[PDB]
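Deliverable D4.2, example record:
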Amino acid sequence: FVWQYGEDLLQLLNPQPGEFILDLGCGTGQLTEKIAQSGAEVLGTDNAATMIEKARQNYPHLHFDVADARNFRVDKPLDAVFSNAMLHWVKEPEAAIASIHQALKSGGRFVAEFGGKGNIKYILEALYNALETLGIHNPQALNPWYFPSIGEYVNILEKQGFDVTYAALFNRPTTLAEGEFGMANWIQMFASAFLVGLTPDQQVQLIRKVEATLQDKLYHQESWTADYRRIRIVSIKA
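Output generated by the structure prediction step:
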């Protein structure tokens, strides 16, 4: 609940006045504004145009663009690339990493956090079980996420030519918004991959099932929690 909101990753980036920084996967631009407040020159990018449209509405004085993390390019070298809560959607991690490395100046830094090995363990179990009982097999293959260990991610980083200076893998259980609707909203919002071949009524049944499986562990004091576990890294272009 407290954990959902934290500027600790921003403290790790430590943006400076005069720096050119990219917020990769900026969403609605909130962290982008925070970077900007440091005095750094920032650019926010997201792969979703709707997101970028909202961001532009939110922060008319900042700069945003649509771009794909896997193959983006920037006009001038960056002092830093910052990314929070997005890279787990990229199942071609080497491609994103290659793009980040080429976008950075020598000595430039890549600071990131995203879902790590062991992330949302219970939610995923509950999802698979629910599909299974609905008659959908191998639900496991529907998983759209890349949740790596420190060793897995850092290996890719180093192979590309980064000096990795910090890595953490840590739990950050977070309270979901909207009280009793929290889990249903989470599923509607993030689990589309699991819902795509279901009938309308089967989607309702799947949400019921998941809530049922999870209620004892993740529902307390009129709110749902999500068992997040994140990977956090700092890497320097050698």
